[PDB]
Design a protein around this ligand. Structure first.
Ligand SMILES: Nc1ncnc2c1ncn2[C@@H]1O[C@H](COP(=O)(O)OP(=O)(O)O)[C@@H](O)[C@H]1O
Ligand SMILES: Nc1ncnc2c1ncn2[C@@H]1O[C@H](COP(=O)(O)OP(=O)(O)O)[C@@H](O)[C@H]1O
Lengths: 71, 374, 50, 117, 374, 50
């Protein structure tokens, strides 16, 4: 700690934060440059794949003919 | 003036920031990773470096395995954290830790062993005369400039909401959610495979994080945005990889941040951030809800996406009763807010009674931080 | 002697080309920032009139 | 103006001036002097001279070569002696000194300053 | 009855298999190699043939450049794949493609375009009535005969693990690793040079693949096996090249399959297959881990090496908590298991409502496969 | 022949240097235009905020 510790390491004198009134309206680095090179939404779950359709309940799908042979 | 201002250190999972008390800005900002070489090196006379910490680890991602010491706000490995703190104190600030107090921040709901080990490390190894531990969202409310409001902080590790009314915090309404930027990065890595681009290792993960930071935004209406993206190619951006290849993302840009509002995409059953804020508000009392509605503050780097404020305001207004007034206040400097108010907390004359002295630590072991802090 | 002259001339030329390239990419960043600031200007002014 | 960089640079310039004045104060014992802290520590000879003056203990011969790896050797010998004298340094490498990282060389000088006196 | 058996075609990285639905075994199995001549033809009068497909390419591999249309589970050369499918339909099965439906398999995570192209070629060029695209690990779980379990399938180009509990698959825990038998063959070439044997061209690639198939095994303990091989020459075998020369494989028998467990030999950062399965299990929920431990299913030809089940069981038992059962279920006919699953999938009575008709394709383009297939 | 190389490389060097200079001048004027734009943005911002 030659010349004192506080003089070797440039610890700031003053508190710069105390000068400003509203920290909300502050930006350090000025702007951002990018160059190219009602109702709320209900939660949704992922769909299933083990049954063909639910378009009409109380339906026996085993009675229905296969899809590909419907011409 | 006494000066001898305390060091303000913000240690999150994503990046570590450090500076002097009473300053408007932190002095050092650097990513919090530790890298080690993984390839067999054959060059005799070349200088040998065992590990790489900070920005020079990021500059040499090719031959390194990057590790994050902090995962979901919990310090998993302590030797890496000691190395990070050593590099912060001696290389980035050029100060002696014995001459200054320090102020650390952490998440609200953490294991107490984390806080105890942090205090024990800061006293025993670095010989700090005093140290304090605070909660990040309270410092965010300090930096906002008001004494009443609800803070929704969202870092790279954890997203938590706290309400504070007239300087009184309600701990039974504090909510913590384990959804953050790292989960979004992993989800982006997963959904980028559909277009054929593959990223596996850690350097590619950092490239994907850069892609997320550059080209992402939150859609106001998700279904109409998906229909617009499927109808034509008016929403398409091209990114340039470090090896010169050019990739195109297009439809994925608004799909990564939407997982913040719909956690069912990631397999979690939890609600989005807007419902978490709404439930934290309605967990409070009756008369203080009107004031909390008008002072909702955003913070953290995860809340830096474009168009997130309007989406949050719309969702909260849909959830809330119609006659109230919803005002989402979002500073353009939220990314550093956790640091900024911390400096203010170190600038107060009353706070000099709040330091945990060396004598108290010697008298009461490492468990004094539970009684002293929060 | 003239063969010795060649290589240093070529090396200086390569360094000059590198400086020119980095100057150009900084220039395109500045121009994109300018027109982005322009339509941001316009939309903020529109909100003020409303 | 990227206020982080501005604050860091205005601390940086003053700390560099004070450090090089202290280094010249010790290095004037032998007939040596440096004018720029960044360029003169690349060769690794000045670090060896300063470490010998401060420790009062001899060091192995520097290699009298102008190659890049000769500079890497000369820096690595000083860092090896610093590791021999119980000085703890993370992410401090010879190539970091040779290519001239500002923060790392300032941290090295600060570490010697706090270790010896 | 008007019930026609639909063709089941398993198209993998290495070989192509094909058969009829409801059968016990595939009718046709042949390598997926397209070859072309590389020398001058001087015997005028012989027939000219532009391309060799399948076993015809393998019999005359001495004068051809062998190319794989599918590499790493992704098909790149579409005309070669058209030739493979066309030779399958017309020379190996001798059926009219426009009469029967077809069923195809693919890796879980892949570029999204392939499916669409796999639809567009199949409906237009071959005029099939209907088709469906399944995922190979689900069909492996069908062939195992159990509703719940975790399936790890490693072919010639890709490795993937999926967990399925009671028929509900968890898509966020599906893991894909790009390590398979092709990289093991390349590593066998790279380590066979130590003994002085040189193998460069594609015919040598087939020869090295045959050597790997005949004379390789997985050591239960790697270090003890290396010490035993260094101690004496008891662990040595001899192979005869088609020229008539004799090579001695020696130490390199177990070093090639050990790259499946320590991918640091190939320069990859990712973990081994056992850690992949363990991480896929721990990514699931708490209550279903016990059933996933008891029902581990191996699949694919790459899992055909001797001593693979014991090593896998030992490694997972070391990783898992020491309370629960670790049972590795590996059927002897595992190499064809995926195809067998297809034969069960196209014979179910409810599956006849799952076919993608030509009418739906004409109505909604090739993108119908994302809505109608998992 | 080697003199002929010297001549061509001298042409290339001189042209590249003055192209670099005009790029730097364009950079400077674009930067100060950006500064004017940013005060305009800030003042209309403050009016809307009040
Ligand atoms: N400009 C940006 N746009 C969108 N996301 C960003 C941006 N900058 C950073 N992020 C995200 O924010 C994270 C950093 O958060 P940060 O506030 O540093 O966390 P903490 O400070 O709590 O550790 C990064 O992981 C990144 O994904
Ligand atoms: N009996 C065996 N022993 C060792 N390896 C084998 C054996 N049979 C096949 N393989 C390896 O498996 C690969 C074939 O994988 P395969 O199951 O055909 O994948 P896919 O069916 O997806 O094409 C071959 O490249 C070969 O290296």
């Amino acid at each position: 700690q030659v010349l004192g510790y506080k003089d070797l390491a440039a610890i700031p004198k003053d508190k710069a934060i105390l000068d400003i009134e509203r920290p909300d309206l502050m930006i350090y680095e000025p702007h951002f440059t990018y160059s190219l090179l009602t109702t709320g939404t209900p939660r949704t779950s992922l769909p299933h794949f083990h049954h063909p359709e639910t378009t009409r309940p109380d339906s026996n799908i085993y009675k229905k003919p296969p899809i590909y042979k419907q011409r | 003036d006494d000066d001898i201002a305390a060091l303000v250190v913000d240690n999150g999972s994503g990046m570590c920031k450090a500076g002097f008390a009473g300053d408007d800005a932190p002095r050092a900002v650097f990513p919090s990773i530790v890298g080690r070489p993984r390839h067999q090196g054959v060059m005799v006379g070349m200088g040998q470096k065992d590990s790489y910490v900070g920005d020079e680890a990021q500059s040499k991602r090719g031959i390194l395995t990057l590790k994050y010491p902090i995962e979901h706000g919990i310090v998993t490995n302590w030797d890496d954290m000691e190395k990070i703190w050593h590099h912060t104190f001696y290389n980035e600030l050029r100060v002696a830790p014995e001459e200054h107090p320090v102020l650390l921040t952490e998440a609200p709901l953490n294991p107490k062993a984390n806080r105890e080990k942090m205090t024990q490390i800061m006293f025993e190894t670095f010989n700090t005369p005093a140290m304090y531990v605070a909660i990040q969202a309270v410092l965010s409310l300090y930096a906002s400039g008001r004494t009443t409001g609800i803070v929704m902080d969202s870092g790279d590790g954890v997203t938590h909401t706290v309400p504070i009314y007239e300087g009184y915090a309600l701990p039974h309404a504090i909510l913590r959610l384990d959804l953050a930027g790292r989960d979004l990065t992993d989800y982006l890595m997963k959904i980028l495979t559909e277009r054929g681009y593959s990223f596996t290792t850690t350097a590619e993960r950092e490239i994907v994080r850069d892609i997320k930071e550059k080209l992402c935004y939150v859609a106001l209406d998700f279904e109409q945005e998906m229909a617009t993206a499927a109808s034509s190619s008016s929403l398409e951006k091209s990114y340039e990889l470090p090896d010169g290849q050019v990739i195109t993302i297009g439809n994925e840009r608004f799909r990564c941040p939407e997982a913040l509002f719909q956690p069912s995409f990631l397999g979690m059953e939890s609600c989005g951030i807007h419902e978490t804020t709404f439930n934290s508000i309605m967990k409070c009392d009756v008369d203080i809800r009107k004031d909390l509605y008008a002072n909702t503050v955003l913070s953290g780097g995860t809340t830096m996406y474009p168009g997130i404020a309007d989406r949050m305001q719309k969702e909260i207004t849909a959830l809330a009763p119609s006659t109230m007034k919803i005002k989402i206040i979002a500073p353009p400097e939220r990314k550093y807010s956790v640091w900024i108010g911390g400096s203010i907390l170190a600038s107060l004359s009353t706070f000099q009674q709040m330091w945990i002295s060396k004598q108290e630590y010697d008298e009461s072991g490492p468990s004094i931080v539970h009684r002293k802090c929060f | 002697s003239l063969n010795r002259r060649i290589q240093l001339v070529e090396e200086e030329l390569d360094r000059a080309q590198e400086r020119l390239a980095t100057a150009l990419q900084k220039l395109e960043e500045a121009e994109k920032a300018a027109d982005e600031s322009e339509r941001g200007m316009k939309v903020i002014e529109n909100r003020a009139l409303k | 103006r990227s206020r982080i960089k501005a604050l860091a640079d205005e601390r940086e310039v003053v700390q560099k001036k004070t450090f090089t004045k202290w280094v010249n104060s010790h290095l004037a014992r032998v007939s040596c002097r440096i004018t720029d802290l960044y360029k003169d520590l690349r060769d690794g000879r000045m670090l060896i001279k300063l470490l010998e003056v401060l420790s009062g203990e001899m060091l192995p011969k520097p290699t009298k070569g102008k190659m890049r790896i000769h500079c890497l050797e000369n820096v690595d010998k000083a860092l090896q002696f610093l590791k021999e004298q119980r000085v703890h340094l993370e992410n401090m490498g010879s190539h970091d000194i040779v290519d001239g990282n500002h923060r790392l060389v300032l941290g090295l000088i600060w570490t010697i300053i706090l270790r010896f006196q």
